[PDB]
Amino acid sequence: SARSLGKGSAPPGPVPEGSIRIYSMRFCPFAERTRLVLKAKGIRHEVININLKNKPEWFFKKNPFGLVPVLENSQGQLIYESAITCEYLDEAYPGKKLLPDDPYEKACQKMILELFSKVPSLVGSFIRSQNKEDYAGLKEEFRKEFTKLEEVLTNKKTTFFGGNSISMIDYLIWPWFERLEAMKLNECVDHTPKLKLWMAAMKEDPTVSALLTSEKDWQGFLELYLQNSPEACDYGL
Amino acid sequence: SARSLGKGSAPPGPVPEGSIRIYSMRFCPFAERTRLVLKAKGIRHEVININLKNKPEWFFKKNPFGLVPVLENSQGQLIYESAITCEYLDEAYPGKKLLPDDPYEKACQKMILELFSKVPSLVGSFIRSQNKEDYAGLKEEFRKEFTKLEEVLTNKKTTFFGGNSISMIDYLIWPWFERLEAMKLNECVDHTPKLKLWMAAMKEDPTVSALLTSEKDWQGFLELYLQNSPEACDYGL
Ligand SMILES: *CC(=O)N(C)Cc1cnn(-c2ccccc2)c1
Ligand SMILES: *CC(=O)N(C)Cc1cnn(-c2ccccc2)c1
């Protein structure tokens, strides 16, 4: 069931009532945002993994851009863009709100999200390594963006980006910091002490911990991704 | 009072109670989003224009990135990023909501906002013209992005991007289409009929009409902007 669907696969059936479907990929950091929210809010759902190297024809009817995550509810309504799927889930399901209701506090979370906006592209580029001379410069980009996040935590004087308790903004940023060890980028935070403390606090969170991927599984994916293998998305069953 | 403040100007005083302040620029399309929301919701406010060619030192304390629009309330709280200032105003002030309360409908508006995300950078690049051979290709980029917006209106079968009545998403996209005539880009919509009808419907909206800038004022700004003049932001008093 967890095996990714690719080109030639049958379009899935309708989403049953009382459940929501996520079109994801087990190693995708953008899809992980949504999976963190689904877990934190205890939402009943089904997972359909997509082979991003060999996409099913029908997935373009889910998202014309062909990117995961994509949410589909029992009414056939489709929601995509990882931050949008997270806010939609926060609003459409009961329980504690991950995004604060206060207009100013909610705006601050989205202001930090904008501040982080360069990091996913920097990670994407770093994975597809070109030469040794580029690495030291691409790591200089990481230090610059991570100091922006350090200044936020310094000015807030709190453990998390939305206060002294975990909230939406922390789950939105976490997937890229989770992969820092597997990418051998642990030195890019050696000058951001509050950010380093935030990473360890995140690893202790029950939701984050339950969705943690082993160092070996990250490596297995990365190796097959650099080989452009259509088995990359299915590493480690 | 409407004259823009620049380097060497005195930091402004506190925002009085019952009012909100916008740090803007009369010809900035990003700041225009916020000004459209302030008008549509009938919000009492004050406008401080910033000389973007000769920024005041204190403006970096309002937005570390030094970009307009920036909101400041009586509590000294600062809000920036044009879409964030618009949603904050919609949530923190009474009256009709510009963003629908329905989680799915609100998500769709933000999905269209993401779809439009390439157009502001394409406009920014087009203003700073390099050569005649680039123009036809940069206009091919516009047709490609405008067809994405055409497909939305076609699939929705409504006059606006959020239904048969104007809503937030329309004010968020409008400033770039308003400037299409002054930029001589009217041929980039000659293959998007619903988008052309949306533009004329927008021009009839009371809020849009009250914030319309004359063709002569757009030209006066553009000429001085291409000359890198610090008088550009203050064209036409
Ligand atoms: C959904 C998506 O954009 N991808 C699957 C690309 C991607 C970006 N970052 N990763 C990543 C990085 C390090 C380790 C595992 C996965 C994948
Ligand atoms: C706030 C900002 O980004 N600017 C002032 C730059 C800008 C982008 N587009 N315009 C523009 C385009 C055509 C006509 C007037 C203004 C300014």
Author numbering:
A (entry chain A), B (entry chain A): 5 to 241
What does the paper say about this structure?
GSTOs have a cysteine residue at the catalytic site in place of the characteristic tyrosine or serine. Consequently, instead of glutathione conjugation, GSTOs catalyse thioltransferase reactions similar to glutaredoxins.
In each case, difference electron density maps contoured at 3σ show each inhibitor covalently bound to the Sγ atom of C32 in GSTO1. All three inhibitors bind primarily to the hydrophobic or electrophile binding site (H-site)5 of GSTO1, but do so in unique ways. C1-31 and C4-10 bind solely through hydrophobic interactions, whereas C1-27 binding incorporates both hydrophobic and hydrophilic interactions. W222 is rotated and pushed aside to accommodate the phenyl group of C4-10, which is inserted deeply into the protein surrounded by W222, F225, L226, I131, M187, R183 and V127. The pyrazole group interacts with P33, while the side chains of residues M29 and L56 from the G-site interact with the acetamide group.
